[PDB]
Design an enzyme around this catalytic site. Sequence first.
Site, PDB file in Angstrom:
ATOM      1  N   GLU A   1       1.303   0.245  -5.202  1.00 50.90           N
ATOM      2  CA  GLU A   1       0.710   1.439  -5.808  1.00 50.90           C
ATOM      3  C   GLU A   1       0.906   2.693  -4.952  1.00 50.90           C
ATOM      4  O   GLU A   1       1.300   2.609  -3.791  1.00 50.90           O
ATOM      5  CB  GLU A   1      -0.793   1.223  -6.036  1.00 50.90           C
ATOM      6  CG  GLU A   1      -1.530   2.466  -6.533  1.00 50.90           C
ATOM      7  CD  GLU A   1      -3.002   2.224  -6.843  1.00 50.90           C
ATOM      8  OE1 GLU A   1      -3.314   1.720  -7.944  1.00 50.90           O
ATOM      9  OE2 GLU A   1      -3.847   2.538  -5.982  1.00 50.90           O
TER      10      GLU A   1
ATOM     11  N   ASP B   1       0.870  -1.163   0.000  1.00 58.60           N
ATOM     12  CA  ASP B   1       0.000   0.000   0.000  1.00 58.60           C
ATOM     13  C   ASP B   1       0.918   1.228   0.000  1.00 58.60           C
ATOM     14  O   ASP B   1       1.927   1.237   0.706  1.00 58.60           O
ATOM     15  CB  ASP B   1      -0.865  -0.013   1.262  1.00 58.60           C
ATOM     16  CG  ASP B   1      -1.809   1.170   1.339  1.00 58.60           C
ATOM     17  OD1 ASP B   1      -2.650   1.317   0.431  1.00 58.60           O
ATOM     18  OD2 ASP B   1      -1.710   1.951   2.310  1.00 58.60           O
TER      19      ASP B   1
END
EC number: 3.2.1.41
Length: 926
Positions: free
Chosen positions: A549, A520
Amino acid sequence: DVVVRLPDDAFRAAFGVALADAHWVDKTTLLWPGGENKPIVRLYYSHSSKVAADSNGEFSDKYVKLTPTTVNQQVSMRFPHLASYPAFKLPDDVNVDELLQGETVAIAAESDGILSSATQVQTAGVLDDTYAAAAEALSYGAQLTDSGVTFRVWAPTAQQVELVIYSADKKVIASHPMTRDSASGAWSWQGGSDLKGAFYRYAMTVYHPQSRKVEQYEVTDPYAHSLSTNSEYSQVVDLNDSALKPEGWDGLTMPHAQKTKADLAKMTIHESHIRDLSAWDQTVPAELRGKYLALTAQESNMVQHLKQLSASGVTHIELLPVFDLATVNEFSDKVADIQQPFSRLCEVNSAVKSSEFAGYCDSGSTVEEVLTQLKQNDSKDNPQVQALNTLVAQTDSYNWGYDPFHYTVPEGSYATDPEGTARIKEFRTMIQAIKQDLGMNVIMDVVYNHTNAAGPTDRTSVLDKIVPWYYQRLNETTGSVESATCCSDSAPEHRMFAKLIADSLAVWTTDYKIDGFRFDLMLYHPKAQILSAWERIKALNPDIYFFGEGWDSNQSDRFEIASQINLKGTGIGTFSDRLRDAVRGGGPFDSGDALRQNQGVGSGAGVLPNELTTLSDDQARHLADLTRLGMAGNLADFVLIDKDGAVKRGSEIDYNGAPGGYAADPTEVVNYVSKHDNQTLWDMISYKAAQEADLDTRVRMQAVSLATVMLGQGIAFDQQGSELLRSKSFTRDSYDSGDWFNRVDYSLQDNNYNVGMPRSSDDGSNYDIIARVKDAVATPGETELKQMTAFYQELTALRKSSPLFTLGDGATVMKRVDFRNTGADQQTGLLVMTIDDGMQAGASLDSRVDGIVVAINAAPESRTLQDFAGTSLQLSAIQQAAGDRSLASGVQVAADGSVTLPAWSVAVLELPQGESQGAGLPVSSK
Ligand SMILES: [Ca+2]
Ligand SMILES: [Ca+2]
Ligand SMILES: [Ca+2]
Ligand SMILES: [Ca+2]
């Protein structure tokens, strides 16, 4: 030495300690602007007290004299963002270990000795320079073997550390002062194996810069591998224990290979959540709803559904936070869910009991029954469903869980028994079920970029209580814990946190047999740290896959970030927002009318405009360029013909100002059109679809949108439920929207659309546009859901059927993949991709075909192609077998070899391979 004193309560306090812009970065280096051009620069320190002027207005506390200097290369490299700070040298004989035991304050005085400024000191840098190497060579936590146990916790600044052992009933049975290792700053305690299963905490006596006092408190182990209910106490456990493993656990293998890039490219992810999966499934035993064990209910609609998805081509289950999250109370008597009596809700939630809904407290209804009756009169002017649900969210069992409490222990609320080691075996039973019985690999979402809390007081502050100001990234001036992530930003750039991360991943890999990890907000991590962690984990599992991401980190000033650009060629995957935005339309920041105006390729940009959009044909074709580039793996060097007929490399196709194509290999790119965060694909199509696009057409738009991902070279990722046209009733950020808005109906009655206006706090600005588009067509029913599932499994089956769809190697993609219907004379919305397996590409990777054609007609017109006249192209048997239920229903393959596709259709054509490898579909020279 001249004694520092206050000038000869208001403007006077101005001559005291303020802020914390002083940085003790290494053994003898202090960076601080306040000491620039100052005759007297000193580092005062107090073991048990707060540095301050005495009754005489003087600073009698002990100190060390600092002299001007220039920051060295070493410090400059470690902390680039502080390289401009005035540097000060400390004597080589300073007793660092002693000063770090209490409070340190940087003070600058004038010639006469009058204070000019005083500030607190950030010590993370010197801590690493002093203890990191020695501390890194050790292992941490309650390390229990058959022979005995060794506890170890890193606390280089603590004055005291005692190991407190608790009975099962949580009564103190012993408090052991631990043994400090001066070299590492680590504390240890060795005992017998009889401590197996014992609960424990570390009693700390440590100075916390935030409160400026020597705090005294008990904290759980940051390396905890087992916990009591709600994480109140850590527990001694040997994860190797056979009693903590399901039968045959040690022999569990990966159902899907991840060795070669070609192997990785076949990765097709189904992003799921423990409650989203079974909270509503009446066919899952009640006691297993919302639990890890629900995955073992082979008789349930949910499990049978996942089983068929697997059989059809879905290869990986990615799990939303299953490590120990903090935002759900694990004590069942403090929780109330919607399936239970409203009376229970009022008993555990005082906010509800004092709200406008108090009248339901002594009703005989369940919360769900009340929410149901509130639907009819719910609207933008009376958002009562979300009004009640917002209160319910405070005490239910629901949350995505991006709130780390303990990084290496499974979450307790998902276990049938949250007390002790029980959850460990249950979690493993689930992993085994998914891999062995459902045939899918498992990926875990990890959240090392931040902690749930920091400071010396918060219940969930663990790391920042044990080693204050070290594990969190702080503001250079105030010393406040940054919250760019949302919460309490961590500092992966600090050596011992990087170690904690790698050690944690090692346990999930080895002891829980996790196949891959999704980071994350990965760009908040240094590129070097992610790579080092991968290097360490590959030694344990050579085929482990890492990806993540973010794309919003502004940490480039502190270190090279793990971004899409910087990770090029490393083998670390990144979610691509290119195809995502091009196909969905618009961006995650859109609100109001923009949500409808910004149509995507999947919702008819240009070809089927709604009443608000102003998108031009040029703008629509640009999105198609990004889409095609994505279908080819979003490679920086892939060559295509753009909207204007120009020859462009992927890096030359613009994406809101940045180079579109950024990867070296398609396995470094994860394509998707729906994910847990932001609106679901169906809700976006509902926001953007033209009023005249009927229900059936919208279902095809969902399928066409997903086709760009499933039939593309990049790794395929999708949200649980896209195959069921999943809706969240327009909720954009459903992390705490409960079972109600996150509902997935495996009984197939509806897609959860139109179940009340979404939460006003985050979607209120969209109530107007929602009211205007919401009822355009009917809400999906069983017929549409079954239709979509068939379309979905058709796409995944096609992807799975041939290695040509998942080449893996960028060079191979460039040698085999091409596109037709490009340039200024293109038929808008029609995506035509060719994949070569003929003589000019090299060896035949598929014995059944010499080439494949992927045609996605995202348009309201029938389209005819003449590009393959005389090739003997055939519609894939898989689609032919689906008949009129196929995405290729109505596709025509005439004698002249021309192909015609109906509106909103997807056709995969093949060149049958004969005696020897054929000519295929060679890439055109550009
Ligand atoms: Ca928890
Ligand atoms: Ca909640
Ligand atoms: Ca910053
Ligand atoms: Ca072949």
